[PDB]
Amino acid sequence: VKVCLFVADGTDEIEFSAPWGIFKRAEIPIDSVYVGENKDRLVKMSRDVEMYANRSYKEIPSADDFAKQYDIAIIPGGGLGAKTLSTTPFVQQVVKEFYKKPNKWIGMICAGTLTAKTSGLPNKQITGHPSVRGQLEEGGYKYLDQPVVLEENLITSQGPGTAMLFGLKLLEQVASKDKYNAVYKSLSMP
Template sequence: MSDSKKADQKKAIVFLCDGTEEMEFTITVDVLRRAKVDVTVVGVNIAKEFALCSRGVKITPDEKFSESLSSGNYDAVVIPGGNGTASILGDHEGAKKLILEFYESKKIVAFICAGTLVAEKAGIPHKHTVTSYPAFKSELEKVYNYSEDRVVVDENVITSRGPGTTFLFALTIVEKLLNVKTVNSLKNEMLTCSSL
């Protein structure tokens, strides 16, 4: 890739914790990388060199969380689901500060499933409409406008419901980072249902 193309290449952080929902994580990372988004997988409070995900799958991050991470070098941050992710990121001051920094810089902040619980803890304003895994509806609708759509886009905040909506979630991020043409190309490449 030429230096000029690298300069134009979109970049994203995807967080990874022990207990992350692996479908939501791997599908999102895969789709973004197919779209030529430069994805950095950032491990947060991982006990070993790999994260032990919610169904026992082991995934190794590209790097561990560092306070030197800045939204200035990236275009989006993605918070996958899984109770581990919601709990760990919800208690991690550095990660929450970074998520809010992305939001305030008008860059994409994307949450799926239980990950949407982190939005409130990170300080994403309550004016937004969000969605999540149904089990968290009662908690989230106390502070946000709540929708049961598969994916909700409200300004620079993208939220989605769960494993079964992850392709649509990831493709929506690609559309907002890049364009519809890339999304359509990916759908054809992956033989994805045209109704997504």
């Protein structure tokens, strides 16, 4: 299994770090893939952390090529980061390709959940940050006020406070119960 954590200028640090750290603990390969202008892959996160992404998306020639490399695509939030990711055709194309495929998985958290709406995903239910609830429900989704929603192979989640639950939900789809439980235990979930 092979994970892509998308990242842009303006991506939220908390929502990035939780899935990152969970998949690393699981010993599941994960790359950060930057969508932006910086030629050095230096990202200015939402709350001003400056981080190097592993890759630029420009390295990947198409969505079909992306699908040959990765099994899980994760779209974190933060207002600016989500605006950029959600309005990038490459990201949308990956999400559309992955949706309802066997052994592919999509995660979106906070304002990142707007990517379901822009890509035209036909899931019925969704969650996202309360600040984007109206926008989601505008798009015909039925909003669920719970930390995480799974429909088909799309995981959505609300905010920085639910980033750990979100990462875990993703991991749960792809890890054995044995591995899941071991990672879970190591986290000290409250």
